[PDB]
A paper describes a structure:
Clostridium acetobutylicum ATCC 824 gene CA_C0359 encodes a putative unsaturated rhamnogalacturonyl hydrolase (URH) with distant amino-acid sequence homology to YteR of Bacillus subtilis strain 168. GH105 proteins have been shown to cleave plant-based and algae-based substrates by hydrolyzing small two-chain and three-chain unsaturated polysaccharides containing an unsaturated uronyl saccharide at the non­reducing end. The suggested mechanism for both families requires hydration at the C=C bond of the unsaturated sugar, resulting in glycosidic cleavage. Transcriptional studies and structural analysis of the CA_C0359-derived protein product presented here support its annotation as a GH105 family protein with an active pocket capable of binding unsaturated polysaccharides containing an unsaturated galacturonate.
Crystals of the CA_C0359 protein belonged to space group P212121, with two molecules in the asymmetric unit and a solvent content of approximately 47.6%, as determined using the Matthews coefficient. The protein adopts a six-(α/α)-hairpin barrel fold with a small two-stranded β-sheet and helix overlaying the end of the barrel near the active pocket. The two tertiary structures align with a root-mean-square deviation of 1.4 Å and contain a highly conserved active pocket. When the sequence alignment was fitted to a surface rendering of the CA_C0359 structure, the putative active-site pocket was highly concentrated with conserved residues. The character of the CA_C0359 active-site pocket is somewhere between that of YteR and UGL. The representative PatchDock results demonstrate that the conserved residues Asp130, His176, Asp75 and Tyr25 are available for binding the three disaccharides of interest. While the mobile loop of CA_C0359 (residues 320–330) may provide some gating action, it is unlikely to completely block access to the active-site pocket. The catalytic site of Cac_GH105 is slightly more open than those of YteR and YesR, and not as open as Nu_GH105, which may allow larger sugars to fit the +1 subsite, and possibly trioligosaccharides and tetraoligosaccharides. Conversely, the loop extending from the gate loop of Cac_GH105, which is not observed in the other GH105 structures, may play an important role in substrate specificity compared with other proteins in this family. Taken with the electrostatic comparison and growth on pectin and PGA, Cac_GH105 may cleave a wider range of substrates than or a different range of substrates to YteR, including ΔGalA-Rha and ΔGalA-GalA, which may be decorated with side chains or be longer-chained oligosaccharides.
Numbering used by the authors: 2 to 361
């Protein structure tokens, strides 16, 4: 049973909201639907993608709900689906919208080591999420339109992020880092947030797999990024839940009351395992592990509804650090956020993992 199509059909039929703001998770979900278009060759999937993005992309290429001057790295992620649409349809408005997003990169603020700040409102901060939204989009953009020298910038951002956010003990990477060490959530020694959040690691491993894929084969930092991906996978396999074969919201604290197996991070990790094996970044010996983990996603997180469609359950709706609610990154904080079903932050990665599983 091909869950990529079944889930795509479920998303469309259940009319999951993908149009209420310029949300990174909406492009992510559409990126999953685009894989279903690719293999089915069924225009209804492409048409759904087009119709969804018509909310945002005006004929003149301006983007509803986007403001460049906010310098929000999340706002770049939806450029990835725009690349796909431009390649598929050749429509100029998508290219103009892409030019507008690329202009953000010109002056988006950077840390002392030249990594994009997560947002203007988060000065001096690197969050793992941003590597997927920003650096990874930038890589896809450069592959299509850019100058190859720009890949050096992108790879440097991955390398510096691993240097600053990695825990030497576990090999896992913390959710966020404040170079200025001024945020109350940031460790006075290291600037790091307190915990390993499942979805944050998921963002980083997806970002690695998707970025390495578009690098020139001879790129000077290609092996370094592959090594980082292997190291992340090693670290994640150490904390995989033995019974379920999936991952917890707070990755290394599975025995702690309140923690839970979380669908979006688990799906992202399974996608990266599968894609990493397919492209040769990870050893072929991991194939059965990856397959078993995929089946674990279905077992733990998928339920059939009476109409024969499916729900994806147990998705952390949102998490972050600081901000108006002064989010402190404690265990209690990560457990406090909503757990929801049929949320695009989980749906997209589940579609993508399904596509990779089916391809294997």
């Amino acid at each position: 049973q091909k869950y990529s199509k079944l889930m795509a059909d479920s998303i469309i039929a259940k009319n999951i909201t993908l149009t209420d703001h310029w949300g990174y998770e909406y492009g992510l979900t559409l990126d999953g639907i685009a894989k279903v278009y690719e293999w089915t060759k069924d225009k209804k999937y492409l048409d759904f993608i087009i119709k969804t993005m018509d909310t945002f992309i005006n004929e003149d290429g301006t983007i509803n709900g986007y403001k460049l001057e906010e310098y929000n790295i999340d706002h770049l992620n939806n450029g990835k689906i725009l690349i796909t649409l431009f390649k598929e349809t050749g429509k100029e408005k998508y290219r103009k919208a892409l030019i507008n997003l690329r202009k953000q990169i010109d002056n988006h603020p950077r840390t002392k080591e030249n990594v994009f700040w997560h947002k203007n409102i988060y000065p001096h901060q690197i969050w793992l999420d941003g590597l997927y939204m920003g650096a990874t989009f930038y890589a896809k953009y450069v592959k299509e339109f850019g100058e190859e020298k720009e890949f050096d910038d992108i790879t440097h951002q991955f390398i510096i992020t691993e240097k600053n956010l990695k825990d030497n003990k576990t090999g896992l990477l913390y959710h966020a880092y404040d170079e200025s060490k001024t945020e109350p959530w940031s460790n006075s020694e290291t600037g790091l947030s307190p915990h390993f959040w499942g979805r944050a690691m998921g963002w980083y491993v997806m970002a690695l797999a998707d970025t390495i894929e578009v690098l020139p084969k001879n790129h000077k930092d290609r092996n370094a990024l592959i090594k980082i991906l292997n190291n992340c996978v090693t670290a994640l396999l150490k904390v995989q839940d033995n019974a379920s074969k999936v991952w917890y919201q707070v990755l290394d604290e599975g025995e702690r009351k309140g923690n839970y197996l979380e669908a979006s991070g688990s799906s992202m990790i399974v996608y990266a395992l599968l894609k990493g094996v397919r492209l040769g970044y990870l050893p072929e010996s991991l194939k059965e592990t990856a397959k078993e983990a995929y089946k674990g996603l279905i077992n733990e997180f998928i339920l059939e509804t009476k109409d024969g469609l499916i729900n994806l359950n147990k998705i952390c709706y949102v998490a972050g650090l600081g901000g108006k609610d002064k989010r402190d990154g404690s265990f209690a904080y990560y457990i406090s956020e909503p757990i929801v079903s049929n949320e695009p932050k989980g749906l997209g990665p589940f579609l993508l993992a399904s596509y990779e599983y089916e391809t294997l």
